[PDB]
Coordinates of C-alpha atoms and ligand atoms in Angstrom, one line a residue:
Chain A
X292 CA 0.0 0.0 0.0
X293 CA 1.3 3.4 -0.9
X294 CA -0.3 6.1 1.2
X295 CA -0.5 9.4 -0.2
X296 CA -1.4 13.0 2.4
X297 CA -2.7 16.0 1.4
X298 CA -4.5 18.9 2.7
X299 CA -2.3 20.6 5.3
X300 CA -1.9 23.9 5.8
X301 CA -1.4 27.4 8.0
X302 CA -4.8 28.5 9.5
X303 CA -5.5 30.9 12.9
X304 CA -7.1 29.0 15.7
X305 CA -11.2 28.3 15.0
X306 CA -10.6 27.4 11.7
X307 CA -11.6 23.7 10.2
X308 CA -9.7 21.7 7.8
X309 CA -10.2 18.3 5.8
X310 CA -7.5 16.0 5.4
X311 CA -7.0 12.6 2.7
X312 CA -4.9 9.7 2.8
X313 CA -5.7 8.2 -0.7
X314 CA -4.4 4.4 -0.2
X315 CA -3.9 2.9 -3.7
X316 CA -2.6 0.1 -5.3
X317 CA -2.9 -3.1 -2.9
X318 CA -6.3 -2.0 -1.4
X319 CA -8.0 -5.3 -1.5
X320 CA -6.9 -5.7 1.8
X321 CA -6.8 -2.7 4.7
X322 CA -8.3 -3.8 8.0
X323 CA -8.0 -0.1 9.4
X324 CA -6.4 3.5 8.9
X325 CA -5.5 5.2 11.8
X326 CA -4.5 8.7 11.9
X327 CA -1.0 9.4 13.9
X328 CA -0.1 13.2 15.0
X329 CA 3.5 14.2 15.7
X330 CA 3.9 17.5 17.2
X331 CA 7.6 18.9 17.3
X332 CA 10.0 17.7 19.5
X333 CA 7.6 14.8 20.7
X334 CA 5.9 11.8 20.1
X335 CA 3.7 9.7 17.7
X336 CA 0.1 10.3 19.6
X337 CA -3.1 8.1 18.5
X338 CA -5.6 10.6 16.7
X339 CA -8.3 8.5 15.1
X340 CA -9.1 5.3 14.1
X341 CA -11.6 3.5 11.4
X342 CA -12.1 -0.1 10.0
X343 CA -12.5 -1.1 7.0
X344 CA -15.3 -3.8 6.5
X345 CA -17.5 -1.6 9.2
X346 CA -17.7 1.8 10.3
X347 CA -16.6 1.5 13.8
X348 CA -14.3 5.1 14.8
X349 CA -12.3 5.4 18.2
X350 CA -10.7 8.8 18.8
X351 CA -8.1 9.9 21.1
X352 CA -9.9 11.4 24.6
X353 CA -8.4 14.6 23.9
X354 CA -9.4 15.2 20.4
X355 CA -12.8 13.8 20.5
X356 CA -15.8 15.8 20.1
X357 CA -14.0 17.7 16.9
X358 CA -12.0 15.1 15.2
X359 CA -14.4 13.0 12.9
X360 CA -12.8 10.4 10.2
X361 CA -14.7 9.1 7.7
X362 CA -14.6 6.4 5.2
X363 CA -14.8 6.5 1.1
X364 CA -13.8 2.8 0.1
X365 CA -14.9 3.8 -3.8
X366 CA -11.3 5.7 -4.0
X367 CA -9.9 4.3 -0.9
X368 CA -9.4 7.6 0.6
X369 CA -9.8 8.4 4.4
X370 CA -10.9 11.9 5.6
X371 CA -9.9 13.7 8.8
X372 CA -12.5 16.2 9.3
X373 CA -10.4 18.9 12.1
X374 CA -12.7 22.0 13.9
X375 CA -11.5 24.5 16.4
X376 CA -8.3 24.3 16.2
X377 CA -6.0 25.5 19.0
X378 CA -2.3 27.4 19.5
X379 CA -1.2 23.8 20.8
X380 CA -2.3 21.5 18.2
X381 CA 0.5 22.0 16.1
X382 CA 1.9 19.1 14.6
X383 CA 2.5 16.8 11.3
X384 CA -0.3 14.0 10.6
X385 CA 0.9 11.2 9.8
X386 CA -1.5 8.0 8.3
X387 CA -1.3 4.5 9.7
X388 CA -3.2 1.2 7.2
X389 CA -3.1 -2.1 8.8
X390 CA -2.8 -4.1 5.5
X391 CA -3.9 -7.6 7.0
X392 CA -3.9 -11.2 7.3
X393 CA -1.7 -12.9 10.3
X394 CA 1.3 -11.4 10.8
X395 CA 4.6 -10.8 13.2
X396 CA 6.1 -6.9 14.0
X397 CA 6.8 -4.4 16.0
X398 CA 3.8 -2.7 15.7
X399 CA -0.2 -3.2 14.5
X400 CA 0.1 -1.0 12.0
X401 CA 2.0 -1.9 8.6
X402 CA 2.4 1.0 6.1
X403 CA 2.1 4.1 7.2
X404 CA 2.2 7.6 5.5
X405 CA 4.9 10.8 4.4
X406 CA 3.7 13.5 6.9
X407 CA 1.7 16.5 6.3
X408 CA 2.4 20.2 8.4
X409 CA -0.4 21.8 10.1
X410 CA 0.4 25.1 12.0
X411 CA -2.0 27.0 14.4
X412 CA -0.6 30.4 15.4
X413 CA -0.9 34.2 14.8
Chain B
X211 CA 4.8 -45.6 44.5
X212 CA 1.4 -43.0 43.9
X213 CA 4.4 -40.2 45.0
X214 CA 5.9 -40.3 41.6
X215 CA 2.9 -39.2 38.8
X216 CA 2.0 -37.4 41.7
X217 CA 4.9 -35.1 41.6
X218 CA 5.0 -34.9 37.9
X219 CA 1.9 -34.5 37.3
X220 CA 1.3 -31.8 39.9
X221 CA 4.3 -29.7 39.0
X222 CA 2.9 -29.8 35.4
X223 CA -0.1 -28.3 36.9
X224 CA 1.6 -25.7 38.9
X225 CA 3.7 -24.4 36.4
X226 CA 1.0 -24.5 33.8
X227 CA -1.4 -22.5 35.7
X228 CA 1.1 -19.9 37.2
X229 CA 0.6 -17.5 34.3
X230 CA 0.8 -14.0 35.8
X231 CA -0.1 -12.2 32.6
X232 CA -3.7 -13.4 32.7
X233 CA -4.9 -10.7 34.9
X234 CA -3.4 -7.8 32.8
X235 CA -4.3 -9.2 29.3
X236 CA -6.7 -6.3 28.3
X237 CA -5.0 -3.8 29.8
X238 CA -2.0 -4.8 27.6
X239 CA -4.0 -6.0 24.3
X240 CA -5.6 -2.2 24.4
X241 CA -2.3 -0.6 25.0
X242 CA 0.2 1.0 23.2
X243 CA 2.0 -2.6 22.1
X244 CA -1.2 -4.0 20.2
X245 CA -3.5 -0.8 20.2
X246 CA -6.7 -2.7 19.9
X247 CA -10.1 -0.8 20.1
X248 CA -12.3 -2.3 22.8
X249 CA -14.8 -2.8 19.9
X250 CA -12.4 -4.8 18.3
X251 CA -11.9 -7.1 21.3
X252 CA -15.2 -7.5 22.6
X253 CA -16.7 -8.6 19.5
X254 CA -14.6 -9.9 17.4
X255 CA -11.4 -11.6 19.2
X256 CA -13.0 -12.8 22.4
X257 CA -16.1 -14.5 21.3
X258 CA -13.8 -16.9 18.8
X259 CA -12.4 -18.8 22.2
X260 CA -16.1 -20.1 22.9
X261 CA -16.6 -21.0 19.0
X262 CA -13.3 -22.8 19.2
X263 CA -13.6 -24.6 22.4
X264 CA -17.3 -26.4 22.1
X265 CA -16.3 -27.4 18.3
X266 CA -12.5 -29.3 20.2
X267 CA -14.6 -30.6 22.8
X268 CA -16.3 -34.1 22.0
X269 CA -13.3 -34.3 19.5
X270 CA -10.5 -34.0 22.4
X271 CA -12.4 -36.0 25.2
X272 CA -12.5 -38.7 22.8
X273 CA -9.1 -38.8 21.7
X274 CA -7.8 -38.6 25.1
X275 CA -8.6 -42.2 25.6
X276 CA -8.3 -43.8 22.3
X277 CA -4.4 -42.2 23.3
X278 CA -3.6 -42.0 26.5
X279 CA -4.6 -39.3 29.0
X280 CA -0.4 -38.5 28.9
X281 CA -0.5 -37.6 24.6
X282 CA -3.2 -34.7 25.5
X283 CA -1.4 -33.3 28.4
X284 CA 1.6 -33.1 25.8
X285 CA -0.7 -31.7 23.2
X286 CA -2.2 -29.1 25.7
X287 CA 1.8 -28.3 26.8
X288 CA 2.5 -27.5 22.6
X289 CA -0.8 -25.3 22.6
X290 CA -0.1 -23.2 26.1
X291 CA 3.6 -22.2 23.8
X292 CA 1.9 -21.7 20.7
X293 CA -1.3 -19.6 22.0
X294 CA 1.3 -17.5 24.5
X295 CA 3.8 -16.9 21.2
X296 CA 1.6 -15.4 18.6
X297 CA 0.3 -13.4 21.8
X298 CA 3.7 -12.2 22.2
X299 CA 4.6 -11.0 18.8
X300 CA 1.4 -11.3 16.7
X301 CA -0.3 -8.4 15.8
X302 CA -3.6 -7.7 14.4
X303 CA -7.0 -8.3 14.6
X304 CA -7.1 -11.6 12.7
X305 CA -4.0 -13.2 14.1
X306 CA -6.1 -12.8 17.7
X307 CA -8.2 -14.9 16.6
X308 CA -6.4 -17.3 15.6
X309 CA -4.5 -17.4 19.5
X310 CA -8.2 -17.7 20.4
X311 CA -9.2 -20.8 18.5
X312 CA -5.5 -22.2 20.1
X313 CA -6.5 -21.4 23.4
X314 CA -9.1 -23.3 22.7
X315 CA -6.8 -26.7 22.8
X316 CA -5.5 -24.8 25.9
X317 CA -8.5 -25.1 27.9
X318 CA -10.6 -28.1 26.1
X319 CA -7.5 -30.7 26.7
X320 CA -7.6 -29.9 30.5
X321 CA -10.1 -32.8 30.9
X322 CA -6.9 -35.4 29.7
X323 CA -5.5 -33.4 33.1
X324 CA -7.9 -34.7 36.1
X325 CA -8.7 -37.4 34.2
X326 CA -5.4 -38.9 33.9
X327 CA -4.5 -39.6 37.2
X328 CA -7.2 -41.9 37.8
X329 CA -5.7 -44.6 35.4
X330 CA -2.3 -44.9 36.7
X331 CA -2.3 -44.5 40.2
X332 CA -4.2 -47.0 42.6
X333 CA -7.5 -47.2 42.8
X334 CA -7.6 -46.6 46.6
X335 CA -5.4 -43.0 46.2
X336 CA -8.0 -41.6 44.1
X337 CA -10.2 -38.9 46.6
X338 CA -6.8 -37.8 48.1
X339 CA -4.9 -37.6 45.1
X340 CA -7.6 -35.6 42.9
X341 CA -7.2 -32.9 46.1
X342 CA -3.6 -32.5 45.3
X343 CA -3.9 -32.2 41.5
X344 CA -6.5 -29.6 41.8
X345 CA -5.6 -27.7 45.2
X346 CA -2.6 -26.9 43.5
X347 CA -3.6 -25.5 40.4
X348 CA -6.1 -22.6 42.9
X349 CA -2.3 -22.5 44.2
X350 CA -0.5 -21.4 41.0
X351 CA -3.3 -19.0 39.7
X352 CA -3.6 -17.1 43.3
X353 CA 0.2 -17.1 43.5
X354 CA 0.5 -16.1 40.0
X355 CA -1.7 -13.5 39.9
X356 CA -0.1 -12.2 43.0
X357 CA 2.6 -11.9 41.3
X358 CA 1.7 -9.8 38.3
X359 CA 0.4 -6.8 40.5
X360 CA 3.0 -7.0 43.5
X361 CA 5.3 -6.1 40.4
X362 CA 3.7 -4.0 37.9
X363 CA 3.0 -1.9 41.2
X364 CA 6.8 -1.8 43.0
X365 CA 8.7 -2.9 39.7
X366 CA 7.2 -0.9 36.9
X367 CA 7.4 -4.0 34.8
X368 CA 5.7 -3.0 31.6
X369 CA 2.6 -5.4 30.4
X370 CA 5.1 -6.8 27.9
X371 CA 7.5 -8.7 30.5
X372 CA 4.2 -10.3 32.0
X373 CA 3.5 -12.4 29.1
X374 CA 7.2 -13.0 28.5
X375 CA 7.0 -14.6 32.3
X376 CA 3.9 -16.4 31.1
X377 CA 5.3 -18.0 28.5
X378 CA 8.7 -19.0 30.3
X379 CA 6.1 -20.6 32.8
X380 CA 4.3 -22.5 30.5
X381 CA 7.6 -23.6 28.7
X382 CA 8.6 -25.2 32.1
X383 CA 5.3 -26.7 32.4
X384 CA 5.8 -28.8 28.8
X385 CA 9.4 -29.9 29.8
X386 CA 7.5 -32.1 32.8
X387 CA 4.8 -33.1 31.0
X388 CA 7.0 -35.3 29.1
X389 CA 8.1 -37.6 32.3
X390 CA 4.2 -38.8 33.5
X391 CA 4.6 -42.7 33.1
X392 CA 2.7 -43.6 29.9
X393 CA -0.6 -44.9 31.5
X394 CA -1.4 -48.5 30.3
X395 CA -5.2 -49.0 30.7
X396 CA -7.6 -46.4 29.6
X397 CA -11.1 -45.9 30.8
X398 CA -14.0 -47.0 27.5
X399 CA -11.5 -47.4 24.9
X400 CA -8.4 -49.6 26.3
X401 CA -10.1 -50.9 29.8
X402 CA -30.0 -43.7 30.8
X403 CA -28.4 -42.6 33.8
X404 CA -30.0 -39.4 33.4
X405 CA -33.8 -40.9 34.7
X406 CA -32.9 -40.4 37.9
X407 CA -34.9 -37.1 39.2
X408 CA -32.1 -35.6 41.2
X409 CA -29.2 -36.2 38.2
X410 CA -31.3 -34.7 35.6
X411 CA -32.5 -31.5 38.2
X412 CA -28.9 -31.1 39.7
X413 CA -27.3 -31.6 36.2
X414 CA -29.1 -28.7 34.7
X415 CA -28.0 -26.3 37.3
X416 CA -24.9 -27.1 36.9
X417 CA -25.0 -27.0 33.0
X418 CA -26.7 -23.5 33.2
X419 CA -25.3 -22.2 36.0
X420 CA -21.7 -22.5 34.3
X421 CA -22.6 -21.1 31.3
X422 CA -23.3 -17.9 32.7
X423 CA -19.8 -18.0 34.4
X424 CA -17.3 -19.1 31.7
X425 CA -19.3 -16.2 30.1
X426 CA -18.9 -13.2 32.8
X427 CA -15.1 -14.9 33.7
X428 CA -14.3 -13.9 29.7
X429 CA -16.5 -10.3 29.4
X430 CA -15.3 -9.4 32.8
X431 CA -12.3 -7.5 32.2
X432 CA -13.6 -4.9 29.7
X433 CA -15.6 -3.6 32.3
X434 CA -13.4 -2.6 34.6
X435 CA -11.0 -1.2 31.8
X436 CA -14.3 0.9 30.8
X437 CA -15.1 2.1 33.9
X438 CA -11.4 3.0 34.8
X439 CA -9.2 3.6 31.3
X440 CA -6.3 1.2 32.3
X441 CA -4.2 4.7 30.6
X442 CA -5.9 7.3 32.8
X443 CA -5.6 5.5 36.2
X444 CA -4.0 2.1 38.2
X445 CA -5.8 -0.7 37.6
X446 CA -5.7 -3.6 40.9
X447 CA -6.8 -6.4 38.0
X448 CA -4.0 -9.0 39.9
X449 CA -5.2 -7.8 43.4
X450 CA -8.9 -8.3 42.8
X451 CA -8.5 -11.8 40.8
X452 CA -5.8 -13.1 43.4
X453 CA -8.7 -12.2 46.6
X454 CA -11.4 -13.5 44.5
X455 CA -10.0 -16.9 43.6
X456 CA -9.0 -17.3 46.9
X457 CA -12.6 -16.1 47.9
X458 CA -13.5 -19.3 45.9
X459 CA -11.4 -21.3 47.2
X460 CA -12.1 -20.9 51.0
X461 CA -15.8 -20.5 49.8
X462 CA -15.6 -24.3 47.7
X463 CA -14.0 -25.4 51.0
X464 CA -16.5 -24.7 53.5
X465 CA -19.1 -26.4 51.8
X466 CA -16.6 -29.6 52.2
X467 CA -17.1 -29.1 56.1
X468 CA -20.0 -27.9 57.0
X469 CA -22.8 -30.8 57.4
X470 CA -26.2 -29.9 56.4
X471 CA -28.4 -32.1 54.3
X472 CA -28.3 -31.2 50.7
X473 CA -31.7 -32.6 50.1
X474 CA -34.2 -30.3 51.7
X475 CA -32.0 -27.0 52.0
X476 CA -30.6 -27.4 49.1
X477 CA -33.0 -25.9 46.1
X478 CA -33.2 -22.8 48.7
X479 CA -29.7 -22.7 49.5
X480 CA -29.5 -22.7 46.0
X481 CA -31.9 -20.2 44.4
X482 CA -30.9 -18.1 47.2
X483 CA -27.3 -18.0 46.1
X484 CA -28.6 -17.7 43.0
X485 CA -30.1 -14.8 43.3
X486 CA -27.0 -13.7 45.3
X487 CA -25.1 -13.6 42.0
X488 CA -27.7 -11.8 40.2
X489 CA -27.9 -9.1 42.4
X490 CA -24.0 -8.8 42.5
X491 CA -23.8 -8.5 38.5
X492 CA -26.2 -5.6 38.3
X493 CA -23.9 -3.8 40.7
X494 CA -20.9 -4.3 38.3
X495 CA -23.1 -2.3 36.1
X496 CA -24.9 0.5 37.1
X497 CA -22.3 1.9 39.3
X498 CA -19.2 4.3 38.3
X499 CA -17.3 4.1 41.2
X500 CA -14.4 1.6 40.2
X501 CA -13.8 0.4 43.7
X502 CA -17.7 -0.9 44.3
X503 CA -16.9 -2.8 40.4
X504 CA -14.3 -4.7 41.8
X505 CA -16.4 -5.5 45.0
X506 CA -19.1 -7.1 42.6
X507 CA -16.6 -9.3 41.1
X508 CA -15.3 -10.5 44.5
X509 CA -18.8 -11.8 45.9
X510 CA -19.8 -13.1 42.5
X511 CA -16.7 -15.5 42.5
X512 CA -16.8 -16.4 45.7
X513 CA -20.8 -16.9 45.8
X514 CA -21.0 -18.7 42.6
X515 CA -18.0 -21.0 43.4
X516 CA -19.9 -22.0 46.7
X517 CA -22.9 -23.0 44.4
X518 CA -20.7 -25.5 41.9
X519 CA -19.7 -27.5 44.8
X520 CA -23.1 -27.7 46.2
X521 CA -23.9 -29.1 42.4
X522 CA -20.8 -31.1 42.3
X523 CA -21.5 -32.9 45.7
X524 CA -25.1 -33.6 45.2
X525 CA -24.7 -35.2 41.0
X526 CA -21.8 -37.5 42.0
X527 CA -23.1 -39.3 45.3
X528 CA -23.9 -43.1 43.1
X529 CA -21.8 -42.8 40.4
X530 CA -18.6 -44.4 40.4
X531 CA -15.7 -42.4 38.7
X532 CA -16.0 -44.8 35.4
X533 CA -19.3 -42.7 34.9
X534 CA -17.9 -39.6 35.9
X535 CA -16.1 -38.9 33.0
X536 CA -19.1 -39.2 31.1
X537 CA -21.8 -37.1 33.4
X538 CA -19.4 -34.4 33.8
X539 CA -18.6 -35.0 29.8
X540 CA -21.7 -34.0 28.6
X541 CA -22.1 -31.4 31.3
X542 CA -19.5 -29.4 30.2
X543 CA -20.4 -30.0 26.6
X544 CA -23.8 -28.8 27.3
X545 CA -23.1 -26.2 29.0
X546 CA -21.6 -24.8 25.8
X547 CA -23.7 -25.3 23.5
X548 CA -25.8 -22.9 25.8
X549 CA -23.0 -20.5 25.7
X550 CA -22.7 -20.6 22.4
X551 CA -26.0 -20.0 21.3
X552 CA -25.8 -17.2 24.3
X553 CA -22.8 -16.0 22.6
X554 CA -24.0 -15.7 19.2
X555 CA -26.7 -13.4 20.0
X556 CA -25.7 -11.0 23.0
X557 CA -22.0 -10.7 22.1
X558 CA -20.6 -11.5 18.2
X559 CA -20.6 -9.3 16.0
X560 CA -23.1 -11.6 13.8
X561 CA -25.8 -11.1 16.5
X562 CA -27.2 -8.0 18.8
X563 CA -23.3 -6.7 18.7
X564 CA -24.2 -5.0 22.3
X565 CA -20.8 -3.4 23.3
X566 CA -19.8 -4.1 27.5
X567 CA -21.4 -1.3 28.7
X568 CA -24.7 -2.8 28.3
X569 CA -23.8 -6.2 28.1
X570 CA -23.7 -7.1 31.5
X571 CA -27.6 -6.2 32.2
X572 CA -28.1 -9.4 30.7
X573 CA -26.1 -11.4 32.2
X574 CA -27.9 -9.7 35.4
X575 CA -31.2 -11.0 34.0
X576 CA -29.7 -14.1 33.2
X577 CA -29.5 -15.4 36.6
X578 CA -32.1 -13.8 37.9
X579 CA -34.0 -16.3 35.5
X580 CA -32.4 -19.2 36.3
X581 CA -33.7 -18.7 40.1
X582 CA -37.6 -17.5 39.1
X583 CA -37.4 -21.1 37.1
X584 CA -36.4 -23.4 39.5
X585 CA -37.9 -21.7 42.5
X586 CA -41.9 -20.9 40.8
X587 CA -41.4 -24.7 39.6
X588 CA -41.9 -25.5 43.5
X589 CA -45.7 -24.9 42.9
X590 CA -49.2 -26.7 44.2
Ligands
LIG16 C1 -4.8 -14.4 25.9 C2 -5.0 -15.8 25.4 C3 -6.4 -15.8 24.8 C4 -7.4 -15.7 25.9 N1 -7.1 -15.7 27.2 C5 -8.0 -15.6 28.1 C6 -9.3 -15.5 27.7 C7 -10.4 -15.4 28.7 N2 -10.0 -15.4 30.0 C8 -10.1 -16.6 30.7 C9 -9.7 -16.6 32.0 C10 -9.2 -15.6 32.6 C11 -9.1 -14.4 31.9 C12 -9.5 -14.3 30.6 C13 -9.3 -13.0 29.9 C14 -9.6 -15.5 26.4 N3 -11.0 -15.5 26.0 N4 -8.7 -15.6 25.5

């Protein structure tokens, strides 16, 4: 799977954004896509979360309530929908697909994505 | 000459059973090695182990005498290092359920376990010698799961090197299981019942009465991670299962003293343990203070251990322990295929799908109805 992001940007505080991750060319399988936030000088932190086969979402306990991702299986993509944005949300997204089938890592997630830059200031 | 597959044969079963990442197996599945939604566990992963282990049931209990009992304890040693290595490194949501569906030879061989000693050891050391096989195993779990939390508390061992102890545990258990002598007469293979009134009444208690348990047992560690995020706050999961197996175990040993009739005040002792059970698995529900979850769990053990031995005591009091494989075969059997069905409707993602939060209000109304059934019966 080769993940693909798109739809950063700079935008003040209050200000709603949509972001993509269009997975293509070995979707037959993708159990999940799980968004992945990296602020600077810190760590991977869980965002979002959506299956494939279903709908079911799970979002981080901080970001619920304004993070919603939703599915498109016709193109494969995965949207982020962001609102209310704050000074401390600044970060790079990252996307995480769990491929499939049995297997034995490091970590659930196979293939992730390239990073996108999303800065909230004045 | 009973001292030596009595050694064996018990220090298989401690060893086996002295897994101290069984208590913290949720708490690290939805964790930051296998981030696994609790939607993804409680519906997708969990419910394969009951699939898996009524479909290797009849298949293993007859196989573990047209072998000998000594083959499955082998085959059960293979499985516990299988089922604790793909849990180790696999990831995923279908890789779980596969380590299910092994777990399944995990727990559905432990009948080639009790069972064996009673072909190689003397018929005379049999009552004794059952008491040491299974007093041990309560032994390895309660010590085990003392364990986990005295260390993930003072240690700040991470969830990881639990299973890692686990699975060294288990790979000490299959190097004895390889010295048991090889048993030489087997019960049916190698060497109706039912019309009785009290069989047939006590049996079905016993049949439905478990059910319920091997249920709440598997779907009763999601509650307490939803009440208390096992990322927000401790969790006491090796505390709380080390008290309540010992709350079963003193509890399973009283009723071996005390002497009271089990024929008259027995139906009432019990529905009224019964109900007892039912009104401690509505209180796991409906409150949000963690502490008062845990206190649910503690008298539900406890009170529903102290009603299997009543059951246990009152169907084997004719039979001799030929028959016992094979009244306690097709109680366990059928006590599945009511779990199953019970399974396939309140929990898999096939069925209702109802997520934990409401789950256990059935479970709550399911023995409450086992006790308006067999006490309105007692009509006239
Ligand atoms: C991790 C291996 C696979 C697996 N393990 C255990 C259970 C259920 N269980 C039974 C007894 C005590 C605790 C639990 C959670 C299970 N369903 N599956």
């Amino acid at each position: 799977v080769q993940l693909v992001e798109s739809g950063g940007g700079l935008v003040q505080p209050g200000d709603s954004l949509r972001l993509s991750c269009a997975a293509s060319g070995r979707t037959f399988s993708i159990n999940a896509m799980a968004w992945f936030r990296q602020a600077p000088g810190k760590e991977r932190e869980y965002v979002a979360q959506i299956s494939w086969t279903g709908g079911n979402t799970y979002y981080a306990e901080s970001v619920k309530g304004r993070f919603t991702i939703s599915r498109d299986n016709a193109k494969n993509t995965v949207y982020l929908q962001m609102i209310s944005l704050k000074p401390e949300d600044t970060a790079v997204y990252y996307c995480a697909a769990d491929s499939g089938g049995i297997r034995l890592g490091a970590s659930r997630w196979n293939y992730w994505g390239q990073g996108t830059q999303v800065t909230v200031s004045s | 000459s009973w001292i030596y597959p009595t050694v064996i044969l018990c220090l298989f079963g401690f060893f086996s059973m002295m897994r101290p990442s069984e208590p913290f197996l949720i708490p690290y599945l939805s964790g930051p090695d296998k981030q696994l939604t609790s939607a993804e566990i409680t519906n997708e992963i969990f419910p394969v182990w009951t699939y898996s282990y009524l479909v290797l049931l009849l298949p293993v209990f007859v196989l573990t005498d047209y072998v000998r009992y000594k083959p499955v304890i082998i085959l059960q040693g293979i499985s516990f290092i299988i089922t604790w290595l793909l849990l180790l490194f696999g990831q995923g949501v279908k890789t779980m359920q596969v380590v299910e569906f092994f777990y399944g030879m995990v727990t559905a061989a432990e009948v080639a376990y009790y069972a064996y000693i009673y072909s190689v050891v003397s018929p005379e050391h049999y009552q004794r010698v059952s008491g040491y096989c299974r007093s041990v195993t309560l032994a390895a779990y309660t010590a085990g799961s003392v364990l986990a939390q005295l260390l993930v508390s003072l240690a700040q061992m991470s969830y990881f090197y639990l299973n890692v102890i686990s699975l060294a545990s288990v790979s000490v258990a299959f190097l004895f299981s390889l010295f048991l002598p090889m048993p030489k007469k087997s019960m049916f293979f190698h060497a109706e019942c039912y019309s009785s009134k009290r069989l047939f009444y006590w049996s079905l208690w016993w049949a439905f009465a478990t059910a319920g348990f091997n249920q709440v047992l598997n779907y009763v560690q999601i509650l307490w991670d939803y009440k208390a995020p096992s990322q927000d706050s401790s969790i006491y999961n090796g505390a709380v299962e080390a008290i309540a197996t010992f709350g079963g175990a003193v509890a399973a040993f009283a009723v071996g003293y005390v002497k009271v009739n089990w024929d008259l005040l027995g139906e009432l002792a019990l529905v009224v343990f019964s109900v007892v059970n039912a009104g401690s698995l509505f209180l796991m529900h409906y409150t949000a203070n963690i502490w008062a979850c845990y206190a649910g769990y503690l008298i539900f053990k406890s009170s529903y251990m102290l009603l299997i031995t009543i059951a246990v005591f009152q169907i084997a009091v004719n039979l001799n322990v030929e028959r016992y494989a094979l009244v306690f075969g097709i109680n366990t059997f059928i006590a599945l295929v009511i779990q199953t069905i019970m399974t396939v409707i309140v929990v898999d993602q096939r069925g209702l799908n109802l997520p934990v939060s409401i789950q256990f209000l059935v479970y709550g109304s399911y023995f409450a109805v086992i006790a308006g059934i067999f006490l309105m019966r007692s009509m006239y």
